Design a binder for this molecule. Structure first.
Ligand SMILES: CC(=O)N[C@H]1C(=O)O[C@H](CO)[C@@H](O)[C@@H]1O
Ligand SMILES: CC(=O)N[C@H]1C(=O)O[C@H](CO)[C@@H](O)[C@@H]1O
Ligand SMILES: CC(=O)N[C@H]1C(=O)O[C@H](CO)[C@@H](O)[C@@H]1O
Ligand SMILES: CC(=O)N[C@H]1C(=O)O[C@H](CO)[C@@H](O)[C@@H]1O
Lengths: 95, 90, 91, 90, 91
């Protein structure tokens, strides 16, 4: 169901991140063909991830994200209940 | 111009890779300079089929096509049938 | 609008690349209070001499001190001595 | 307010910058209106310390403070000011 | 000379503007050390320019003036007989 992901990208701590149906997941990349990645991935965000147009890491752990006019930089979401967009530092336009 | 690309991303060895009109190219990033003109074509078709394309820091290339995920060292040259030999990890 | 770009990504070297329409741009990633500085100190000493200090549309800097007008490109670092290479115009 | 501002200038991108009691605000030039009440406050504290505060054509903000000279992106840059400080390698 | 001006700034087009003693003047920037800028400068206002605390251009050549809590916008004056203050928009 990899073609159904909106984002699929990598942290510098080796975790694979993926945005699927407005949720975001993470986990080490699969190694074999029979590995079921979704089934061992941690869900670290439950709604609102599809709004984004770019979403990537720098090598220092920071997660960049573009939502329409705006660029955010912050450490990645840590759980389900971590409202990332609410605490992410806007560095984007002149907000 | 640059917008005709479907993918355009950097490898950790410092090389920019660009999917254009079904072919893939690589060459060092531009700084001032016609990139596409001095760029090595390293694939000759099949490259639009991908939804994602990305390097890990070890120099492995990741690719998603038709609900399948692939991993291997990047296409070496236009004679290299990458998708035929890349490892399905889906 | 950061969305206008079709491509937005980083270099191992720490630079931000953005493709916008047909062109590509290479620049410093934007940053998170304290302007102010830091950053960035472009000259040290001699600067409150001046009554006016302003730019050419071409990026040449003008300054007025003691009834004389001075012109030169701006210093790129605080080691660069400006007035010293600034030529005076107005007789 | 107008006569209470220390500084009142425009960026190469057409935004009006105002420094008032140690705070700097930006926002679209008036055309009429309550410019202050509806501006974005982009800095707080020490803004009155400068003797000069002005742009270069390329969107760098210059500042004179305590006999020294300073240069940086304005506080709270936007995308257009980024593109202008950027090297176009298109 | 220069230190007697209250305002001395550049239009987006490259012309130098200066307020000297309630009067305002314009002309291409001094080209050399010998050049007497005021001598050839075109007088573009003959009264009422000491009143301003700020006097500046935007990118499109509009001129702004601040005077007792009123801001004034309009294309710049062009001569002795151009009543700028009265045709300016009174923000
Ligand atoms: C884009 C974003 O930050 N989404 C988060 C959010 O809005 O708060 C939720 C908790 O209420 C999280 O589950 C979501 O991950
Ligand atoms: C997606 C992919 O692997 N494309 C390759 C392919 O189809 O085989 C060709 C050589 O036979 C290469 O030129 C292509 O680059
Ligand atoms: C007015 C002027 O140009 N002052 C410069 C100066 O005196 O030399 C120094 C470089 O050594 C610089 O720090 C100062 O900016
Ligand atoms: C501030 C201002 O606009 N002053 C003008 C004015 O009031 O009328 C005069 C001619 O009528 C001009 O010479 C002045 O420049």
């Amino acid at each position: 169901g990899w073609s159904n992901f909106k984002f699929l990208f990598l942290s510098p701590g080796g975790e694979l991140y993926g945005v699927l149906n407005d949720k975001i997941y993470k986990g080490t990349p699969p190694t074999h063909d029979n590995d079921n990645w979704l089934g061992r991935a941690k869900k670290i965000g439950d709604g609102g991830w599809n709004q984004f147009q770019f979403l990537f890491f720098d090598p220092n752990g920071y997660l960049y994200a573009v939502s329409k006019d705006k660029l955010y930089k912050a450490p990645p979401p840590q759980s389900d209940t971590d409202n990332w967009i609410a605490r992410a530092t806007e560095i984007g336009s002149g907000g």
